[PDB]
RNA sequence: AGUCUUGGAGGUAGAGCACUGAUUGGACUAGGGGUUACCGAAUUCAGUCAAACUCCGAAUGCCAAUGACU
RNA sequence: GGGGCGGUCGCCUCCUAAAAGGUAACGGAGGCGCCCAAAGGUUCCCUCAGAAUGGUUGGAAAUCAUUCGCAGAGUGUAAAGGCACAAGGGAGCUUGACUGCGAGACCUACAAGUCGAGCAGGGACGAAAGUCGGGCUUAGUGAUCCGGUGGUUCCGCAUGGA
RNA sequence: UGGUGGCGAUAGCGAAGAGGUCACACCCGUUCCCAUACCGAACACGGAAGUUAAGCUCUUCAGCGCCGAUGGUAGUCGGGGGUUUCCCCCUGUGAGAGUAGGACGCCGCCAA
RNA sequence: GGGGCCUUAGCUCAGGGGAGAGCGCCUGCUCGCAGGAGGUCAGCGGUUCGAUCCCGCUAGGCUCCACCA
C-alpha cells in the first residue's frame, strides 16, 4: 500500500520575455517585451500596457538600453 | 486658526489670593487662583 | 453575498450596463451617471428593480 | 507675550555670552511645545476621547487632533486606526502663553510638587514632562471631570545638548527639582 | 547528533558533487586537521562517530572544531514499495564534502596526539583523507 | 534639536513629480518658473536640446518696482516672458509650476502669460 | 542556411554572502537563572552552506542587423 | 511503474527547467472558483519597518518628541516579478468599473486567451499639459443546444395583424 | 553666483575648514488671497530689522560607499581519454572573489 | 500499511477576541445549601494584533479497508 502526493499542480507557462530583437524594425503596436512588473521600462516611443507589456508606439528600430545604474529600458527610434 | 473649532483666546487677568495680578493668555477673561508662584510654600522656601 | 446588477437609463429605460455590488454594503439601488448609447449622453442610470 | 519679550531681551543675550555662540542664529530657542494625552481607556468608551479632546482644548486654547492606533495589539485590545489619544502642537504666541501659564500657575498646583526632573531631557535638548492630573490647569472645572487623566508635555528646542536646553528652560523659569 | 534546528524545505534534490571545496580548504581555527581527498555525503552519524573517536583519544586534552555541518536532508521511501506516489519521507542529514574540504580541526595537543586522533576519526568516514597543518 | 530639510529640497522633490509628465519640445517648450524670497523668474526651456529659448525676470530693467516678490511683480514678468517669446516664434507652451502650488505669484505669472500671447 | 562581424534579451555553470533561510568558533554582553561569565539573546570579528538565496556572473544556446565569403 | 483500493482531474504562482521561449513524472511547494461603490478615476500632497534617548497612567509592546533609518515596511489575497521621479500613505472632486471601435502585435492545432497606439461620441478630474475603456502585474472561470428577460427602421407561409 | 538640463555614487555618505554686498537662503509679519484631520510647522501671501549658524557655493581628505584592470583560478563551447555519483588532456573562451589603480564632478543652456 | 474520526479541569461535557457549565473534591453547614480548587485546551511550528478555535505536521486511541493471483 502507498500514500499520495499533495502537489502535482502548475499553471500554464505565459511565454514572457523579449518578442523583438535589438536592431530589429518593428511596426507601431508591436509587442517588444512581456513581463510581470517593470523588469524593463518603456523608453522613447514605447508604451507600457495594463499587464506591463512593452509595445512600440511608432514604426522604427528597437533598442534595449541601460536606464541609469540598475534598470533597463527599451526604445523605438524612427528610421531615417 | 480654522474658523469655528478654536476657543476665542483673550488676554486674561489672573488674580491670586496674595494680591499678585498677572496677564496670561486664556479663554476666560478672569482667572482666580488660590496659589501662585509667589505664594506657593514650595517657591517661598518656607 | 456579492450579486450581479443591471443599470438602466432613467430617461429611456434601456438596460445599458451590468455590474456587481455587495448587497450588505450597498442595500439600496445604486445610481451612476453613465453614457447612454440611445440618448448619446451621460444620463443617470439606476439598478433595476 | 511676557516670556517672548524676556527671551529676546534677556535670555538670548545671556545664552550667547554663556555658550560663546558665533552668531545669534545658533542661540537655543523653544521651537514648539507638544502636549499629549494617551487615552488607552478609549478602547472601552468612545466618548472618553471626546471628553479628553474638550479638556485639552480648554488647556491648550486649540483644538487637538485625535490620535489613532497605528498597529493592532491584542494585549491592549487595540485595532489599527482606533482613536486612543489626543495630541496638540503649540507654536509662536500660544506656545509662550501655555508655557508661562504652565510654569506660573499649573505646576505649583501639583499636589506635593517637588519641582520638575532635571533628567527628563532626551540627549538632544528636548524636555519631556509627565503631568499626573489635568486638574492642575485652572481651565478644568472639577465637577465636569468624569475621570482624572494625565498628559505628557514635550518642550522641543533648537538646542543640540541637554546643558543648553536646561539653561534655556532655567532662564525661562522652569522649576527644576533642587 | 548534529541537525538543523529548522529547514526551509524538508525534501531537497540530491544535487551533484562536482569540483573541489568552495571554502574551508585550509586549517583556519585549530593547529592540525583532516582534509577530504574524495567527494562524499558525510552523515551526521559518521560525524558523531568521528568526533567521539578523536575526542576520546585526546583525554579532554584539546579542542575540536567540526568544520562541516549536516544541513542537507535526504529522503527514503518505506521498505518494499513500488516507484512513484510522491517523494519519500525525510530519513537523515548529510554534509556535502568535496575534495580539499577540511572536515575537523584540532588544537591544544601535540602533532603526535593530533595525528593519531585524526587517524582514528578517518576510519569512521567513507572517504580517503590526509592529515594537514595550518600554514 | 529640530533638524528640517530646506524648502527648496522639498520643492525639488515636488518639481521632479511635475517633470515626470511635463517636458518641453521645440514646438511646445516648457515655461519654467522659479520664485524666490525676494524675486520671481521665468525661463522658456527646450528639454530635448537642453536650451533656454527665452527668459524674463524681476532682475530685468524693464520691470522697475521696489516691491519685487509679490503678485503685482509676477504679472509684469509673465507679460515680458510672453512678449519676448513671441519674437522668437513661440505660441504653444507647457506651464511647469516648478513644484510651487498653482496659486498667487506663480498663477499670476501664468495668467499674465496667457493674457499676453502664449497658449496653454 | 552556415560562418565571420556587430548589437541585444536572459540569471544557468561557477562564485558570493548584499537579502532570505541554515550554520561553526572567538570576542563582548542585554537579560534570565544560581552578587556571579552561572548560562546567555543581540552586537562584533573571523568561518561554512543553499533546486524553490543572490551584491555578482560565464561558456554556450537564442533573437536580430549589416556587409562579406560560401 | 499491472488492476482494485487510496489520490488526482479546470485555473493561478514558484522550483525542477540545463542564463530566449517551451519542456515530463502519482516530482518539490502554495493558492483560486473572489473581494472593493473605493480597495476604481483624477488632482494635489506625502513617506515606511524597527531601534536609540526622554516620557503620569503605561508595562517589552498603545500615544507623543527627538535623532538614526533603502526599505529591514506596505502593496485586499498565493507566489513570483515589480514598485520610494512610488505601483506604498493621505485628502478634495468624481463614476472612464464609458458607447462605437481599432493600425499593429503576442500567444496559439482549433476553440479561445492577451496587449494595443489611435479615431469618433459624450464625460470625470486638472489652471493647463494631460491622465482615465477598473484594481502594481499575472487566478476569481465554463463551449454549444435549449429556455427566460429587456430592446429592436429585421422576417411574418394569400393579405392586414398575430 | 542663481536658475534649469544631461551624464551609471568616478557624482554619494562622512570629516575639516572657508565664503556672502548683490544673488540664494535662513529670517521677521499674518491684514488679505490661501492653509493646517491641531498648529502661518508646512503651504500661502507681505516685508527687508541681520545672520552666514544651517541649506547653498568653493576648497582639503580615501575612513566608509562607489568605479576598477592585468595576471591567475573556477566554470565552459568544441575535440579526445579514463580507474566514470566523478576525473584528466588539447585548441578556444573565461568569471566571481582578491588586487594594482581610479575617484571628494563631468558636460551644457539662460540670467545676473 | 492506506483512508476517516477523535484527544478541553480528577471525571463528563460549552466554545478568531482571550476556557465555562455540572459533577467530583474542598470550605461550614443545618443533606441540601452557600461559596472555592481543578486547564502545557493531546504534542509541535505558523497563519495571524488575536488561535481551544483556522493551517500543516507528530503521537496515542477508535472505526473502516489491506483485494486478484
Ligand atoms: K512495476
Ligand atoms: K481619490
Ligand atoms: Mg509558471
Ligand atoms: Mg487590468
Ligand atoms: Mg552552484
Ligand atoms: Mg477510488
Ligand atoms: Mg536554455
Ligand atoms: Mg527559460
Ligand atoms: Mg445537445
Ligand atoms: Mg400573413
Ligand atoms: Zn499667590
Ligand atoms: Zn437613455
Curated annotation (Swiss-Prot), chain B:
Keyword RNA-binding applies: yes
Underlying gene: rpmE
Binding site for Zn(2+): 16, 18, 36, 39
One GO CC annotation: ribonucleoprotein complex
MF-aspect GO terms: metal ion binding; rRNA binding; structural constituent of ribosome
Annotated protein name in UniProt: Large ribosomal subunit protein bL31
GO biological process: translation
Family: Belongs to the bacterial ribosomal protein bL31 family. Type A subfamily.
Effect of residue 39 to A: The protein does not accumulate and cells grow very slowly
RNA-binding as UniProt keyword: yes
Manner of cofactor binding, per the entry note: Binds 1 zinc ion per subunit. This zinc stabilizes the protein.
Induction: Only accumulates during exponential growth.
Cofactor(s) the protein needs: Zn(2+)
Self-association state and partner proteins as the record states: Part of the 50S ribosomal subunit during exponential growth.
Keywords: Metal-binding, Ribonucleoprotein, Ribosomal protein, RNA-binding, rRNA-binding, Zinc
Highest taxon of source: Bacteria
Residues of the full protein shown: 1 to 46 of 66
Function: Binds the 23S rRNA. While neither of the L31 paralogs is essential, this protein seems to function as the main L31 protein. Has a lower affinity for 70S ribosomes than the non-zinc-containing paralog L31B (ytiA); is displaced by it to varying extents, even under zinc-replete conditions.
From Swiss-Prot, chain C:
A Gene Ontology biological process term: translation
Keyword Transport tagged: no
Annotated disulfide bonds: none
Keyword terms: Ribonucleoprotein, Ribosomal protein
Biased composition (Basic and acidic residues): 25-49
Signal sequence annotation: none
Region Disordered, annotated ranges: 20-49
SUPFAM superfamilies cross-referenced by the UniProt entry: Zn-binding ribosomal proteins
GO cellular component, one term: ribonucleoprotein complex
Gene Ontology molecular function, alphabetical: structural constituent of ribosome
Keyword Signal in annotation: no
PROSITE patterns, sorted: RIBOSOMAL_L33 (PS00582)
Superkingdom of this protein's organism: Bacteria
NCBIfam families found in the cross-reference section: PRK00504.1, PRK00595.1, rpmG_bact
PANTHER family assigned to the protein according to its UniProt record, in alphabetical order: 50S RIBOSOMAL PROTEIN L33, CHLOROPLASTIC (PTHR43168), LARGE RIBOSOMAL SUBUNIT PROTEIN BL33C (PTHR43168:SF2)
Record family assignment: Belongs to the bacterial ribosomal protein bL33 family.
Quaternary structure, from the entry: Part of the 50S ribosomal subunit. Interacts with VmlR.
Protein known as: Large ribosomal subunit protein bL33A
Organism: Bacillus subtilis (strain 168)
UniProtKB/Swiss-Prot annotation, chain E:
Family matches, as InterPro entries: Ribosomal_uL16, Ribosomal_uL16_bact-type, Ribosomal_uL16_CS, Ribosomal_uL16_dom, Ribosomal_uL16_sf
SUPFAM superfamilies documented for this protein: Ribosomal protein L16p/L10e
CDD domains: Ribosomal_L16_L10e (cd01433)
Alphabetical list of Pfam families matching this protein: Ribosomal_L16
Keywords: Ribonucleoprotein, Ribosomal protein, RNA-binding, rRNA-binding, tRNA-binding
UniProt keyword Ligase, yes or no: no
NADP as UniProt keyword: no
GO molecular function, one term: rRNA binding
Gene Ontology annotations for the cellular component aspect, listed alphabetically: cytosolic large ribosomal subunit
Entry-linked PROSITE patterns: RIBOSOMAL_L16_1, RIBOSOMAL_L16_2
Gene Ontology biological-process annotations: translation
HAMAP family reported for this sequence: Ribosomal_uL16
Binding partners and assembly: Part of the 50S ribosomal subunit.
Function: Binds 23S rRNA and is also seen to make contacts with the A and possibly P site tRNAs.
Protein family (similarity comment): Belongs to the universal ribosomal protein uL16 family.
NCBIfam families: rplP_bact
Protein name: Large ribosomal subunit protein uL16
Organism lineage string: Bacteria, Bacillati, Bacillota, Bacilli, Bacillales
Curated annotation (Swiss-Prot), chain F:
Record-level Gene Ontology MF annotations: 5S rRNA binding; structural constituent of ribosome
SUPFAM superfamilies in UniProt: Translational machinery components (SSF53137)
CDD domains (UniProt xref): Ribosomal_L18_L5e
UniProt keyword annotations, A-Z: Chaperone, Ribonucleoprotein, Ribosomal protein, RNA-binding, rRNA processing, rRNA-binding
A Pfam family matched in the record: Ribosomal_L18p
UniProt keyword tRNA processing present: no
Superkingdom, natural source: Bacteria
A GO cellular component annotation in the UniProt record: cytosolic large ribosomal subunit
InterPro entries given in the database record: Ribosomal_uL18_bac-type, Ribosomal_uL18_bac/euk
Keyword rRNA processing: yes
Single biological process term from Gene Ontology: rRNA processing
Function per UniProt: This is one of the proteins that bind and probably mediate the attachment of the 5S RNA into the large ribosomal subunit, where it forms part of the central protuberance.
Family membership noted in the UniProt record: Belongs to the universal ribosomal protein uL18 family.
NCBIfam families per record: L18_bact (TIGR00060)
Assembly mode: Part of the 50S ribosomal subunit. Part of the 5S rRNA/L5/L18/L25 subcomplex. Contacts the 23S rRNA and 5S rRNA. Required for catalysis of RNase M5.
Protein's recorded name: Large ribosomal subunit protein uL18
